[PDB]
Design a protein around this nucleic acid. Structure first.
Ligand SMILES: [Mg+2]
Ligand SMILES: [Mg+2]
Ligand SMILES: [Mg+2]
Ligand SMILES: [Mg+2]
Ligand SMILES: [Mg+2]
Ligand SMILES: [Mg+2]
Ligand SMILES: [Mg+2]
Ligand SMILES: [Mg+2]
Ligand SMILES: [Mg+2]
Ligand SMILES: [Mg+2]
Ligand SMILES: [Mg+2]
Ligand SMILES: [Mg+2]
Ligand SMILES: [Mg+2]
Ligand SMILES: [Mg+2]
Ligand SMILES: [Mg+2]
Ligand SMILES: [Mg+2]
Ligand SMILES: [Mg+2]
Ligand SMILES: [Mg+2]
Ligand SMILES: [Mg+2]
Ligand SMILES: [Mg+2]
Ligand SMILES: [Mg+2]
Ligand SMILES: [Mg+2]
Ligand SMILES: [Mg+2]
Ligand SMILES: [Mg+2]
Ligand SMILES: [Mg+2]
Ligand SMILES: [Mg+2]
Ligand SMILES: [Mg+2]
Ligand SMILES: [Mg+2]
Ligand SMILES: [Mg+2]
Ligand SMILES: [Mg+2]
Ligand SMILES: [Mg+2]
Ligand SMILES: [Mg+2]
Ligand SMILES: [Mg+2]
Ligand SMILES: [Mg+2]
Ligand SMILES: [Mg+2]
Ligand SMILES: [Mg+2]
Ligand SMILES: [Mg+2]
Ligand SMILES: [Mg+2]
Ligand SMILES: [Mg+2]
Lengths: 150, 47, 14, 117, 142, 110, 56, 103
RNA sequence: UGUAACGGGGCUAAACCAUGCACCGAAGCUGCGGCAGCGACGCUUAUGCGUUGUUGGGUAGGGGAGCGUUCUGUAAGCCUGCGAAGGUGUGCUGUGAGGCAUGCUGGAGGUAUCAGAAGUGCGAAUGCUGACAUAAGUAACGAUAAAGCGGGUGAAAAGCCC
RNA sequence: CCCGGCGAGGGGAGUGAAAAAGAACCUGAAACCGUGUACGUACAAGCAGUGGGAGCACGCUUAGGCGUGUGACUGCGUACC
């Protein structure tokens, strides 16, 4: 606290409590008793536990039919209109598209649908897998991800 | 589902907060006995 | 306010 | 993650004052002093729920004693004649009879007398 | 169901006259206190004076046992510091015999507005005549 | 109609004015005015200048009939007490409070 | 030389019970002017018993 | 004509046609129950008492409704000893209605 | 200080002794209801504990279980200008932390659930800050060099002007 | 516009959705100070409550009483850390 360190009043004589510095956490405009440091909250989850988490999330996506597997699936013009119409055809609304490789057209088409995210077969993650309504995995991505999980 | 994952029982022991009332067990010297040295701010003999 | 005087010499109860 | 604890403290102090409604002076306007009164009122309630079971037995007994000395037998010999005749009426019913139905209590007294005879 | 309670307005209070001649002061005033407080009534309720007014006659002729006649002292302090004025039994009987009974019954009545409202219903009289005949007190042999 | 006339931030204590205000209550204005005119106080001046108002705001807004006009409800409330500082012996300072009072008069035909 | 508890609103009011003001019982209309004036005080116009005793 | 009968060890005195408030009885909220333990029958003037019981005594009641009583608040407390405890209680009660009384 | 060495009245039994019978007398025990824990054949299915027996005063303290507030995700979801938070009443409900529904004020935000983090819960620290009490309409109005009157102006003159 | 001192402050009128949004300006709590109503209180003793409880006032149901407000009188009761 930008201040001084002088006893605001002597130790005796005063009728008020024994105080030491205008900065004390008690006082108004004083310091916080335990000021939070800028910390890190990254916690280590074992490689094996992360793999064993994905190998369970995917099995349950299968069991819950939220995993729609397809062959090649992209577009020809980077038109979010085109991709949205394509999803209308697929009768879906909120989908994580795990393609084999980021197809710049598909990526640019999905950039602007806040219910659709296109990820390569490697940048997948549990939070997204679970959160998104349905995940569509091109068979390329299926093979890639199963070999990644090993 | 995101709002359905719940940890297995006994995982989170739910912490222990000292000096937060009379109902909670601790509080008013928070499980560190009455006055003394082992009950001071930072007190406690060396190893 | 900002200044506090010393109290009177207390009872010399020696 | 600062939490301005300005609603819980308020709606708790108020919850105490609402219980303190009806107390004299600042004892019902100030939370630092209504709190003592409310815990003291709790002690008094928890203790009077037994002092009442005492007082009402010692009132029923007084009424039965009245209406028994009326009919010529002390409370002791009355209860004794009752228990001997194995009549299990309790002091509350005895007192209320002795107040409302005088001839019923007179019949009770006569039965107790006969049992002691 | 709630037990009965005598109501202040609904209750009736009889009268009684008692002849203190030769009666022992205690065993007179004691029964007087019982009656005044209302124990003799089955309609008793300890927060309402269900007792019957009592008129004491021959209050001079009350008697005490043993040598109490000249040794039972009645003290009272006059508020002022040194004045603890005492008065023996004979001096009390000679000055004003009402106070003998009145004290013996204030001592046995409850202490509190109910007590000082029960003691309002005792009408001790020194001699043998009482002008309360208009209320028709029944004779009482205690 | 209950005509209201107030006086907020009146430079006078909230007690010295209640002393006067409690004189005139439920009284015909024809009598309350006399009382205040021959009351020896300073709050008498305030309450009289306010009662004049209330009567005028009755006769020029709510109709007429200064004849039948009782001071239905009159009350004096604490107001913003101006702080000031006064020095005492040995350097001590004591915060004195210049008091203020919201006078309220409510006169009605009744 | 100083209090030792605070006298409540009860005392702060009862002690003021007698601090109430004394409303003047009644004025007295002048003899001939018809104006109001305190007894034995001259009327606001300088009349007293109906005599222009002031002319001011 | 009233009857003295005990249900929860607390003997009530009830006339035919009025309600009571018992300790809960395992009876559906609209069923008819009886008490075959009458302790005394006013029977107008000639009261029947019975040594342990009025032998022929039978009271017929209709259970009006169950319920939970007023919320009492227990507050245990020891001054200066850092100990208090709050607790509620609502005793179950079975409002019945004395339909019939038989000596 | 004021009896003052029965608690008081008072008592010659209303004292002491001995015998016996009654009765009052606790939150003890019993009676009916309710909860919680522990233990024992169950039900084999993480049990309705179907049943029991038993335990349940508790400070320092150990253990178990929770309520609640802020923020994040679930949530571009849901609620909401046909009234959100907040404030204030009322009723119901839970064993408690508490919740719910709703009246009025408010006039635009809130957030279910299941998890996650805490600046997570105040009555005290001669605590800090702001506000308002009390003493109180009381002391005091600051040199005991001194004021009085007429006229003026002014809404009001003891204090301003003459 | 009216009261007002060619004031302060206010009541009307008017904008405004709202002026108990009027610049002392969103909500507007609590302490604290009033005004009105209901009940109690001027022969009564004490951690100021609780248990009981009459009376009185009021809302509903009718007339079964109940709920609310007070609480006369009485048993017990010497705050908190
Ligand atoms: Mg800071
Ligand atoms: Mg790594
Ligand atoms: Mg504490
Ligand atoms: Mg420890
Ligand atoms: Mg300590
Ligand atoms: Mg030690
Ligand atoms: Mg230690
Ligand atoms: Mg914040
Ligand atoms: Mg008992
Ligand atoms: Mg006593
Ligand atoms: Mg100086
Ligand atoms: Mg002291
Ligand atoms: Mg005065
Ligand atoms: Mg002496
Ligand atoms: Mg027990
Ligand atoms: Mg038991
Ligand atoms: Mg036990
Ligand atoms: Mg325990
Ligand atoms: Mg402990
Ligand atoms: Mg919030
Ligand atoms: Mg408003
Ligand atoms: Mg904190
Ligand atoms: Mg605080
Ligand atoms: Mg001050
Ligand atoms: Mg004052
Ligand atoms: Mg003084
Ligand atoms: Mg003086
Ligand atoms: Mg002076
Ligand atoms: Mg001077
Ligand atoms: Mg002059
Ligand atoms: Mg001068
Ligand atoms: Mg103006
Ligand atoms: Mg706004
Ligand atoms: Mg505001
Ligand atoms: Mg307020
Ligand atoms: Mg009176
Ligand atoms: Mg007297
Ligand atoms: Mg007193
Ligand atoms: Mg009481």
């Amino acid at each position: 606290v930008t201040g001084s360190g002088k006893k605001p009043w002597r130790q005796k004589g005063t009728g008020r409590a024994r105080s030491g510095s205008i900065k004390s956490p008690i006082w108004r405009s004083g310091g916080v008793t335990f000021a939070a440091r800028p910390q890190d909250h990254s916690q280590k989850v074992n490689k094996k536990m992360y793999r064993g988490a994905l190998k369970s999330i995917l099995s349950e996506l299968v069991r819950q039919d939220r995993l729609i597997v397809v062959e090649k699936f992209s577009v020809e013009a980077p038109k979010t209109k085109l991709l949205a119409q394509k999803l209308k055809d697929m009768a879906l609304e909120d989908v994580l598209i795990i393609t084999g490789e980021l197809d710049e057209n598909l990526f640019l088409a999905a950039r602007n649908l806040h219910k659709v995210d296109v990820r390569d077969a490697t940048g997948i993650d549990p939070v997204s897998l679970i959160a998104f309504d349905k995940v569509v995995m091109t068979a390329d991505a299926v093979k890639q991800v199963e070999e990644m999980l090993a | 589902r995101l709002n359905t994952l719940s940890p297995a029982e006994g995982s989170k022991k739910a912490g222990k907060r000292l000096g937060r009332g009379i109902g909670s067990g601790l509080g008013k010297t928070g499980g560190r006995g009455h006055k003394g040295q082992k009950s001071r701010s930072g007190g406690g003999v060396r190893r | 306010p900002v200044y506090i005087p010393r109290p009177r010499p207390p009872h010399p109860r020696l | 993650a600062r939490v301005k604890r300005g609603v819980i403290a308020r709606a708790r102090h108020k919850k105490i004052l609402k219980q303190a409604k009806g107390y004299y002076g600042a004892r019902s306007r100030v939370y630092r002093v209504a709190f003592q009164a409310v815990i003291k009122a709790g002690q008094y309630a928890y203790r009077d729920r037994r002092q009442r079971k005492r007082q009402f037995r010692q009132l029923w007994i007084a009424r039965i004693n009245a209406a028994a000395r009326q009919n010529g037998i002390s409370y002791s010999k009355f209860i004794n004649g009752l228990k001997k005749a194995s009549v299990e009426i309790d002091r509350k019913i005895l007192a209320d009879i002795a107040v409302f139905d005088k001839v019923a209590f007179t019949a009770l007294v006569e039965k107790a007398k006969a049992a002691l005879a | 169901m709630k037990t009965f309670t005598a109501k202040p307005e609904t209750v009736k209070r009889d009268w009684y006259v008692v002849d203190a001649t030769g009666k022992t002061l205690g065993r007179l005033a004691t029964e007087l206190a019982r009656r005044l407080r209302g124990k003799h009534k089955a309609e008793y309720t300890p927060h309402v004076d269900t007792g019957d007014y009592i008129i004491v006659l021959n209050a001079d002729k009350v008697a005490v046992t043993g040598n109490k006649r000249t040794d039972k002292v009645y003290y009272h302090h006059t508020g002022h510091i040194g004045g603890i004025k005492q008065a023996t039994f004979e001096e009390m009987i000679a000055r004003r015999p009402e106070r003998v009974i009145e004290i013996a019954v204030k001592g046995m009545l409850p202490k509190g507005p109910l007590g000082r409202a029960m003691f309002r219903k005792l009408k001790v009289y020194a001699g043998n005549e009482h002008n309360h005949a208009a209320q028709q007190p029944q004779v009482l042999d205690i | 109609m209950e005509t209201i006339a107030k006086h907020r931030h009146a430079r006078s204590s909230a007690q010295k004015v209640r002393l006067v205000a409690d004189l005139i209550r439920g009284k015909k204005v024809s009598q309350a005015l006399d009382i205040l005119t021959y009351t020896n106080k300073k709050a008498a001046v305030l309450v009289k200048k306010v009662l004049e108002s209330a009567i005028a705001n009755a006769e020029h807004n709510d109709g007429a009939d200064i004849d039948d006009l009782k001071v239905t409800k009159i009350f004096v409330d604490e107001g913003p007490s101006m702080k000031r500082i006064m020095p005492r012996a040995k350097g001590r300072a004591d915060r004195i409070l210049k008091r203020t009072s919201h006078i309220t008069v409510v006169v009605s035909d009744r | 030389a100083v209090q030792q508890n605070k006298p409540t609103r009860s005392k702060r009011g009862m002690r003021r019970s007698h601090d109430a003001l004394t409303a003047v019982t009644s004025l007295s209309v002048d003899k001939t002017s018809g104006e109001k004036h305190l007894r034995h005080h001259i009327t606001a116009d300088g009349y007293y018993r109906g005599r222009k005793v002031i002319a001011k | 004509m009233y009857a003295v009968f005990q249900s929860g060890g607390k003997q009530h005195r009830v006339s035919e046609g009025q309600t009571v408030r018992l300790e809960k009885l395992d009876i559906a909220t609209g069923e008819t129950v009886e008490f075959a333990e009458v302790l005394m029958i006013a029977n107008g003037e000639e009261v029947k008492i019975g040594v342990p019981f009025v032998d022929g005594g039978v009271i017929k009641a209709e259970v009006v409704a169950h319920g939970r009583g007023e919320k009492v608040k227990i507050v245990k407390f020891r001054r200066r000893k850092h100990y208090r405890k709050q607790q509620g209680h609502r005793q179950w009660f079975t409002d019945v209605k004395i339909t019939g009384i038989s000596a």
